Amino acid sequence: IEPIVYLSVASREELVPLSEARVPVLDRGFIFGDGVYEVVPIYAEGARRAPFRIAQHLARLARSLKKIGIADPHDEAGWRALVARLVDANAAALGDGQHAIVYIQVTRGVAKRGHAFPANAVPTVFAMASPLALPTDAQRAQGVHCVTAEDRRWLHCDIKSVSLLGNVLMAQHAAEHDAAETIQLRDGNVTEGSSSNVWIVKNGELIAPPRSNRILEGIRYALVEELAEECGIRFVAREINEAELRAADEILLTSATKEILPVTRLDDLPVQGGRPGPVFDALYAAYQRAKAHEME
Amino acid sequence: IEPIVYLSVASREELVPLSEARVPVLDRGFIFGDGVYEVVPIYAEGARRAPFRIAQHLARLARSLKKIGIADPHDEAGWRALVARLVDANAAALGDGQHAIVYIQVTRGVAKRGHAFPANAVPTVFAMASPLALPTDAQRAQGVHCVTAEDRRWLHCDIKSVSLLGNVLMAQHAAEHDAAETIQLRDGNVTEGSSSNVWIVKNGELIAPPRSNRILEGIRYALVEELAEECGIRFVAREINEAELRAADEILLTSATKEILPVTRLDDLPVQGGRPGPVFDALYAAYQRAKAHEME
């Protein structure tokens, strides 16, 4: 069964098979990377599918839109209804028991090509629901490999934008090095991954960089704060320099698709003893409780 | 008469009216800004249209493609033939005497959404010929206004990429300030405009920043070097700090669509006496000779 996607262009909307969904070539999403996006995890219990932290994802979408001057085309209820309809439309394509991600992209729309904002732009909206494969048993048990690289991205990383060539290059770098992610450093301090946030553990304390324009605030930033408090784990927001990263007791990744994931090799060297640590274990369990609590 | 555009997706190519040209929603140009582009000026003498410096533009296209790992889908002759066919196809839409720009965009193609390079990607190619309005008599006589801003772009500015949200924000900033361009500064030194290169004149000498990953090497960089030598104007490649920019005798912009243009107001203050200077005049005349010489 083919995925069914949502597409609205020039205020004309459709729900159609993926193979039939096409955008005009002059959409500024295609020409200028002029748009923002969200990825929302959708968990299945049999035929029942429910989003996780969708209020917080939609609040970020609103922030990303405002940051680049695109008017938000739906209220929160409207976005929620759109996502629900899209997920429902994909019940057969996904199948019972199958988790999903909902991808939402909003661009400034179609106009004569010119860099400044076009007068009276109508935003384009694209949304898709596709299967989500969470990190496996094996990956949680063994942990994953990350490499490091210099952060050469722009300085508006607080916007979740589709101008993602810099992130694409870092993801490809990771893949070429048999790694799940590239941990970027700027001025010798950790920023983030190509599509995940980075945490370390040192002497029983959970540590993350402070919120800033070098780092996208993941929906998991607030969540993991909550989880650490629940678990009685001290959380410290603080710059992490390269030495501190390499000497960490644990290194963790978070994202919508990763949940929380232990990093047990860094640039081909084991992280401590090369196995996931107890803070990962506790936070991962707490994440699963949070999923059950908020959705069931 | 509607513009006719070229589109190749998944190795299937067409020449079609603009209104009929659409790309699949999962093209990585739309999803990830994962692509590069060129803008080539096409000058008309009546019904005859000819590209200017197209060899150099195509060489840059090849460099941009290689820099992000996309295989080049044509040899130089193939690109030249594509451009010629496209311009011919648009003879009626443009009309006699009408200059054009040819826009060429190449993306990594359509695939399941994932940041790393997809295995066996077939690049998408989009090309359009649209009317070019050069800066007017009035603009050359009076000069244009620029504003300055901090350079918050990424650090691979040597790639002419379509991940252009950062450039879009700077172009919009300029428009909001009744300005033609935003001159960016990084670490207190001039880099470039949102879509143009920046030059100053001080004590009869032409000055531009050095080639680097903070600045796209315009096709006009080599050209203007040639023109300055022809005119007996000393050219110096050197960092320009903010003070030197504001105290310049002349400030100039170059791009395919601007040719060379004098900047006579900077952040709402006159540049010297607020009128275009003699180095602008000489270089502009030399540019026109170069056009006549290389194309006629």
Side-chain angles (χ1 to χ4, degrees), chain A residues 191-218:
Chain A
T191 53
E192 62 180 340
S194 66
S195 59
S196 66
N197 293 122
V198 177
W199 312 70
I200 71 162
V201 182
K202 190 63 180 182
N203 299 328
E205 304 190 346
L206 180 70
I207 307 164
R211 297 172 172 89
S212 84
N213 70 350
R214 295 177 175 199
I215 302 166
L216 185 78
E217 179 185 335

Short mmCIF file of all heavy atoms in Angstrom, two decimals, chain A residues 191-218:
data_model
loop_
_atom_site.label_atom_id
_atom_site.label_comp_id
_atom_site.label_asym_id
_atom_site.label_seq_id
_atom_site.Cartn_x
_atom_site.Cartn_y
_atom_site.Cartn_z
N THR A 191 28.34 21.40 20.14
CA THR A 191 27.05 21.98 19.78
C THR A 191 26.02 20.86 19.71
O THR A 191 25.38 20.56 20.72
CB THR A 191 27.14 22.80 18.48
OG1 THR A 191 27.71 22.01 17.42
CG2 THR A 191 28.04 24.01 18.71
N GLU A 192 25.88 20.20 18.56
CA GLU A 192 24.89 19.15 18.43
C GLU A 192 25.23 18.25 17.25
O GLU A 192 26.25 18.45 16.57
CB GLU A 192 23.48 19.75 18.30
CG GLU A 192 23.31 20.64 17.05
CD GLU A 192 21.92 21.23 16.95
OE1 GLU A 192 21.01 20.68 17.58
OE2 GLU A 192 21.76 22.26 16.26
N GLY A 193 24.38 17.26 17.03
CA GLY A 193 24.51 16.39 15.87
C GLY A 193 23.86 16.97 14.63
O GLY A 193 23.29 18.05 14.67
N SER A 194 23.97 16.26 13.52
CA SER A 194 23.32 16.69 12.31
C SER A 194 21.79 16.70 12.48
O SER A 194 21.10 17.51 11.85
CB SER A 194 23.73 15.80 11.12
OG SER A 194 23.27 14.46 11.27
N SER A 195 21.24 15.81 13.31
CA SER A 195 19.80 15.84 13.55
C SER A 195 19.43 15.33 14.93
O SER A 195 18.37 14.74 15.13
CB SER A 195 19.04 15.04 12.47
OG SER A 195 19.46 13.70 12.47
N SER A 196 20.34 15.54 15.88
CA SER A 196 20.10 15.10 17.26
C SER A 196 20.82 16.02 18.23
O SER A 196 21.75 16.72 17.86
CB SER A 196 20.57 13.67 17.46
OG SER A 196 21.98 13.58 17.32
N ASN A 197 20.36 16.02 19.48
CA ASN A 197 21.07 16.73 20.53
C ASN A 197 21.98 15.79 21.29
O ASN A 197 21.77 14.57 21.30
CB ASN A 197 20.09 17.42 21.49
CG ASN A 197 19.34 18.56 20.82
OD1 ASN A 197 18.11 18.56 20.78
ND2 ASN A 197 20.07 19.54 20.28
N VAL A 198 22.99 16.37 21.92
CA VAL A 198 24.08 15.63 22.53
C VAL A 198 24.12 15.90 24.03
O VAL A 198 23.94 17.04 24.45
CB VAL A 198 25.44 16.01 21.89
CG1 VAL A 198 26.61 15.27 22.58
CG2 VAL A 198 25.42 15.72 20.37
N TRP A 199 24.36 14.86 24.83
CA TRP A 199 24.43 14.95 26.28
C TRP A 199 25.65 14.16 26.73
O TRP A 199 26.01 13.18 26.06
CB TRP A 199 23.19 14.33 26.94
CG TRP A 199 21.86 14.78 26.36
CD1 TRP A 199 21.36 14.48 25.12
CD2 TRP A 199 20.90 15.61 26.99
NE1 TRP A 199 20.11 15.07 24.96
CE2 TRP A 199 19.82 15.79 26.09
CE3 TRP A 199 20.84 16.24 28.25
CZ2 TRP A 199 18.70 16.55 26.40
CZ3 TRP A 199 19.74 17.00 28.56
CH2 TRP A 199 18.67 17.15 27.64
N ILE A 200 26.28 14.52 27.85
CA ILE A 200 27.26 13.61 28.46
C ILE A 200 26.92 13.36 29.91
O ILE A 200 26.06 14.03 30.49
CB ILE A 200 28.72 14.12 28.34
CG1 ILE A 200 28.95 15.33 29.26
CG2 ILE A 200 29.07 14.40 26.87
CD1 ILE A 200 30.43 15.62 29.54
N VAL A 201 27.58 12.35 30.48
CA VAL A 201 27.47 12.01 31.89
C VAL A 201 28.88 11.98 32.43
O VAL A 201 29.76 11.36 31.84
CB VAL A 201 26.77 10.64 32.13
CG1 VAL A 201 26.63 10.35 33.62
CG2 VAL A 201 25.39 10.59 31.42
N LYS A 202 29.09 12.68 33.53
CA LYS A 202 30.38 12.65 34.19
C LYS A 202 30.15 12.64 35.69
O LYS A 202 29.48 13.53 36.21
CB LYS A 202 31.23 13.85 33.77
CG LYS A 202 32.67 13.77 34.23
CD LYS A 202 33.37 12.57 33.60
CE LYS A 202 34.82 12.49 34.04
NZ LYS A 202 35.54 11.35 33.39
N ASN A 203 30.69 11.62 36.36
CA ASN A 203 30.54 11.46 37.80
C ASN A 203 29.08 11.49 38.25
O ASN A 203 28.73 12.08 39.27
CB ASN A 203 31.35 12.53 38.54
CG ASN A 203 32.83 12.44 38.23
OD1 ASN A 203 33.36 11.35 38.00
ND2 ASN A 203 33.51 13.59 38.21
N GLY A 204 28.23 10.83 37.47
CA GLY A 204 26.84 10.64 37.85
C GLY A 204 25.94 11.81 37.48
O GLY A 204 24.73 11.77 37.71
N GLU A 205 26.53 12.85 36.92
CA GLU A 205 25.77 14.03 36.53
C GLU A 205 25.54 14.10 35.03
O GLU A 205 26.45 13.87 34.23
CB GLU A 205 26.46 15.31 36.99
CG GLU A 205 26.75 15.35 38.47
CD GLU A 205 27.21 16.72 38.92
OE1 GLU A 205 27.56 17.55 38.05
OE2 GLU A 205 27.21 16.96 40.14
N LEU A 206 24.31 14.43 34.66
CA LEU A 206 23.93 14.62 33.28
C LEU A 206 24.24 16.05 32.84
O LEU A 206 23.90 17.00 33.53
CB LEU A 206 22.44 14.32 33.10
CG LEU A 206 21.88 14.48 31.68
CD1 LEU A 206 22.40 13.40 30.75
CD2 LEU A 206 20.36 14.41 31.77
N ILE A 207 24.91 16.20 31.70
CA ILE A 207 25.36 17.52 31.27
C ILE A 207 24.96 17.79 29.82
O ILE A 207 25.15 16.92 28.96
CB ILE A 207 26.91 17.66 31.39
CG1 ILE A 207 27.37 17.29 32.81
CG2 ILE A 207 27.35 19.07 31.01
CD1 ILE A 207 28.87 17.01 32.93
N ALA A 208 24.42 18.97 29.54
CA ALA A 208 24.11 19.37 28.16
C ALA A 208 24.53 20.80 27.93
O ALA A 208 24.58 21.59 28.86
CB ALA A 208 22.62 19.21 27.88
N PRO A 209 24.84 21.15 26.68
CA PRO A 209 25.13 22.55 26.40
C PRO A 209 23.91 23.45 26.68
O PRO A 209 22.77 22.98 26.66
CB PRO A 209 25.49 22.54 24.90
CG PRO A 209 25.76 21.12 24.56
CD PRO A 209 24.87 20.32 25.46
N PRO A 210 24.15 24.74 26.94
CA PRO A 210 23.05 25.69 27.15
C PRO A 210 22.26 25.97 25.86
O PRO A 210 22.79 25.75 24.77
CB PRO A 210 23.78 26.95 27.63
CG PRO A 210 25.15 26.84 27.03
CD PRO A 210 25.48 25.37 27.02
N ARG A 211 21.02 26.42 25.98
CA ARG A 211 20.22 26.82 24.82
C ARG A 211 20.86 28.02 24.13
O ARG A 211 21.26 28.97 24.81
CB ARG A 211 18.78 27.16 25.23
CG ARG A 211 17.96 26.01 25.82
CD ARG A 211 16.63 26.53 26.37
NE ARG A 211 15.72 25.48 26.78
CZ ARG A 211 15.68 24.95 28.00
NH1 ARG A 211 16.51 25.38 28.93
NH2 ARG A 211 14.81 23.99 28.28
N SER A 212 20.96 27.99 22.80
CA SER A 212 21.61 29.07 22.02
C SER A 212 21.35 28.98 20.51
O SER A 212 20.68 28.04 20.06
CB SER A 212 23.11 29.06 22.25
OG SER A 212 23.74 28.12 21.39
N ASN A 213 21.87 29.94 19.74
CA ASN A 213 21.69 29.95 18.28
C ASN A 213 22.65 29.01 17.55
O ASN A 213 22.71 28.99 16.31
CB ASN A 213 21.83 31.38 17.71
CG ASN A 213 23.27 31.92 17.77
OD1 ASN A 213 24.16 31.33 18.40
ND2 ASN A 213 23.50 33.06 17.12
N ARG A 214 23.44 28.26 18.31
CA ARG A 214 24.30 27.24 17.72
C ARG A 214 23.69 25.86 17.83
O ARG A 214 24.23 24.88 17.30
CB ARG A 214 25.67 27.23 18.40
CG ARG A 214 26.45 28.48 18.18
CD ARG A 214 27.77 28.46 18.91
NE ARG A 214 28.54 29.65 18.58
CZ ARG A 214 29.86 29.78 18.75
NH1 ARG A 214 30.56 28.77 19.25
NH2 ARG A 214 30.46 30.91 18.40
N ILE A 215 22.57 25.77 18.55
CA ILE A 215 21.97 24.48 18.88
C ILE A 215 20.45 24.54 18.82
O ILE A 215 19.84 25.40 19.46
CB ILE A 215 22.37 24.00 20.30
CG1 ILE A 215 23.89 23.90 20.43
CG2 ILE A 215 21.72 22.67 20.61
CD1 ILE A 215 24.37 23.76 21.86
N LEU A 216 19.85 23.61 18.08
CA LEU A 216 18.40 23.52 18.02
C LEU A 216 17.89 22.97 19.35
O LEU A 216 18.42 21.96 19.84
CB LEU A 216 17.95 22.60 16.89
CG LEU A 216 16.42 22.64 16.79
CD1 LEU A 216 15.95 23.91 16.09
CD2 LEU A 216 15.82 21.41 16.16
N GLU A 217 16.89 23.61 19.94
CA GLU A 217 16.33 23.07 21.18
C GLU A 217 15.39 21.92 20.85
O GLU A 217 14.25 22.15 20.42
CB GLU A 217 15.59 24.14 21.97
CG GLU A 217 14.98 23.55 23.25
CD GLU A 217 14.11 24.52 24.02
OE1 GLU A 217 14.31 25.74 23.91
OE2 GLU A 217 13.23 24.05 24.76
N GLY A 218 15.87 20.69 21.05
CA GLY A 218 15.06 19.51 20.80
C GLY A 218 13.88 19.46 21.73
O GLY A 218 13.91 20.02 22.84
#
